[PDB]
């Protein structure tokens, strides 16, 4: 005997966050907060340099949200944990394979609803213990126990999304890896450095020097007719991007589908 | 009885690999437009960079080890 | 006759760690401390330059997290001690290979479970003696004494990570090699320098001279509108890396997978 | 009787030559999924940079100096 | 008649060490300490430029015992002596050819057991006099007198590593050429040159002059934007290392499996 709430089974899609949680957890339970984003800015400070106004909080969060949504689409991840209500159809040979299906977003947190219908009638509900899942490819498949396609027969509903890593320098497969954070304040870190970029000195001024009386200075800064002020630490921004990007790849994998 | 009966496999290029909904809306629109009698004859349009086929079977299957059986 | 702890036979898989210690290891016992960090940076300090604060040991700990695991993703290796609950499938050419099986993290320290399944009842659990492992590789194979495929039959528990080294210069297959603790810090590395780059002189500084009365001098500095106060140190790093990574990708080898 | 009986060599390229652990481990993976009647038709999957198969002798052996003999 | 230890035959496999002395036996007996990489860097002199601090002999074990792996991995050896626990599959051609066996580690300094078992007890273990080995490449052969496969059947011990040499200008097989070890310094000297480099001149500084009340002072570091201020000799030393490795390759030769 087994104890289990009806739609999750501990053997094949054990229940891993309760429903209700979703709305709760957000960007700074993962640790993009605005503070790490200026960590990774230390000794730098950002201000208007007409007034004593530094870039509030809104501002960083707002880019930090477009940031995990670029880390979204540069790898076909779903991120946050969400609910997805998703029909699919028949295709006979993956049917025959055990009734086999890829989630068009992955990875999977767990499965609540495996069900078949030919009208909105739901006409065979399979049970619980029946349905196993591979969490981190999405893969849903089914085992029983005791023309050649049509559209949307079958309906799924699941969980996608990863959790917050629980134990330092680990992560399950239903849970984030570390470099997924560092890639998305990366990517925070090249729009702020866009915007700091071009507030060294004046606007548009490569190099200045005054002389005044016998009172001389000379200042030449890091903008350049051809770079700019800050193409610097994009350049290595994007040097570090590229591995970290490419690394992570191998975890994931190429896609496939058959035809 | 078992598998490795594929004809071969066809390579698209692209920058960033496409996600799996694009290609299961792909494989949608391969089915309905070609698969069986149905649309048989026809000829799919693709414009991405650069395609291939990769071969891994022979044109044509036949039996092995014919004289050594006899 | 022979004494040992059921799960742990001294033929094929001995015991190596004990389960309660796997909480009790981390980044500390390996030697990723802070101190490493500074070593490697002798006469350098780095601090905010309109303060008298050096960054503290958390940042110091945050980026050797994240470098180990971007470690843990150049190669296909897991790290630190963990335990594992995994589920495979059943492949008949390998289940008839003497039950082959390549664990999806490695190296193994040791395999506490190994079971077949059905609904969740086992329907047959292996005697210890039987089964025996490859540590690195992470192999699993089965020694019996006295459709083609199906999801999630099997299932395997086992512990994946490597133990500190005990002894100087040298390391067993199961015990973490110098390089991996020596790449890690150079991944930690790059982030600092990336920090410590552009704090030199003030912001976006390249060149400075003043005049003042008699008074004059001048620098110039490692900045450029092309290249960064670091990059020399960046270059470095990245060129001492490309050999240590493909030299220890030669100690695992590539991968395979049958299809 | 003798050797020469090699029907080619299996190159892979690689900037460090593997470790002989690695290409033990290696082995074994070969035997297990591809050797013998099990597992015969499958097809293995390699990643690495290049990969190259140079044959050693004909497609098909045959008995020489057949007519010399005669 | 022939006196000898059970283990050791002087006939394939004659003793060489002591199986204590693996203990005794550490860096400083090959040549390995800091006094060869101070004198190597004669004339140059390292230190805190805030302080009259130079830096301590644990730095240099710590760079040399991490330089000695880098060499153990860019050339597969197991370099300083120690004991191996060894088990390995039956392969029917090579247990055919003699019983071929070709170690994991090499060079071989000695073999003390080889057996065959089914479940922990050992079927059958050879007499002494039958087994042959070649120490440089591992191979362990035999020779009695008067499915295809199977997993971890044979069991073998054995130590791997290199003695330090005896006499001047050469080195036996089983024996330290004395390329390692002036290898194993360079790649020291790469991290300490990469350390030294950043003292030269304050911080990040590439150019200097004063000029105050008639006294005038001019300096221009290597450092520069591009490279750094011992990139020089780090190149000198990458040439000499691709020259000396290369050279040592052909010593041991190239790997290979039959599949
Ligand atoms: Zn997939
Ligand atoms: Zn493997
Ligand atoms: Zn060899």
Redesign the interface.
């Not at chain 2, 009885?1 to 490795?4: I, P």
């Not at chain 2, 960033?16 to 909904?21: A, L, N, P, R």
């Given at each position: 005997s087994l104890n289990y709430e009806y739609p999750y089974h501990p053997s094949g899609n054990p229940k891993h966050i309760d429903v209700s949680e979703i709305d709760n957890l957000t960007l700074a339970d993962y640790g993009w907060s605005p503070d790490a984003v200026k960590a990774y800015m230390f000794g730098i400070v950002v201000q208007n340099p007409d007034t004593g106004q530094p870039m509030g909080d809104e501002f960083y969060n707002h880019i930090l949200e477009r940031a995990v949504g670029k880390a979204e689409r540069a790898l076909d991840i779903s991120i946050l944990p969400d609910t997805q209500h998703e029909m699919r159809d028949y295709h006979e040979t993956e049917f025959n394979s055990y009734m086999f299906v890829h989630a068009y977003r992955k990875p999977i947190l767990q499965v609540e609803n495996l069900q078949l219908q030919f009208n909105g009638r739901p006409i065979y509900k399979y049970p619980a213990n029946w349905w196993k899942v591979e969490h981190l490819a999405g893969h849903v498949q089914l085992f029983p126990t005791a023309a050649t396609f049509a559209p949307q027969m079958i309906r799924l509903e699941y969980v996608s999304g990863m959790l917050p890593r629980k134990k330092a320098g680990r992560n399950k497969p239903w849970e984030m890896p570390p470099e997924l954070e560092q890639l998305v304040i990366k990517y925070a870190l090249k729009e702020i450095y866009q915007v700091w970029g071009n507030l060294i000195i004046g606007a548009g001024i490569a190099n200045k020097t005054l002389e005044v009386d016998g009172i001389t200075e000379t200042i030449g800064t890091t903008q350049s007719a051809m770079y700019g002020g800050a193409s610097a630490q994009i350049l290595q921004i994007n040097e570090d991007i590229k591995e970290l990007l490419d690394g992570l790849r191998a975890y994931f994998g190429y896609n496939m589908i058959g035809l | 009885?078992?598998?490795?009966t594929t004809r071969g496999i066809?390579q698209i290029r692209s920058d960033?690999?496409?996600?799996?909904?694009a290609?299961?809306n792909?494989?949608?629109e391969?089915?309905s437009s070609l698969?069986?009698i149905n649309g048989s004859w026809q000829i799919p349009v693709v414009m991405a960079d650069d395609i291939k086929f990769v071969n891994?079977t022979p044109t044509a299957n036949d039996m092995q080890f014919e004289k050594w059986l006899n």
């Open positions: - | 009885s078992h598998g490795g066809l960033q690999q496409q996600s799996q909904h290609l299961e792909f494989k949608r391969w089915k698969s069986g891994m």
